[PDB]
Amino acid sequence: ICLXIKXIXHXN
């Protein structure tokens, strides 16, 4: 969603 943290979420 826009937090830019690698390792959690879709992959951004």
Instruction: Give the three-state DSSP class for 2.
Output: coil
Write down the least CB distance from residue 8 to ligand GPP, Å.
4
Residues in contact with Zn ion by the rule CB under 5 A: 1-2, 12
Q: CA torsion 1→10→3→5, rounded to 10°?
A: 180
- Cβ atoms of residues 10 and 3 within 8 Å: no
Residues 1-12 that bind ligand GPP (CB under 6 A): 1-5, 8-12
Write down the least CB distance from residue 9 to Zn ion, Å.
6
Q: Interface with ligand GPP by CB under 6 A: which residues?
A: 1-5, 8-12
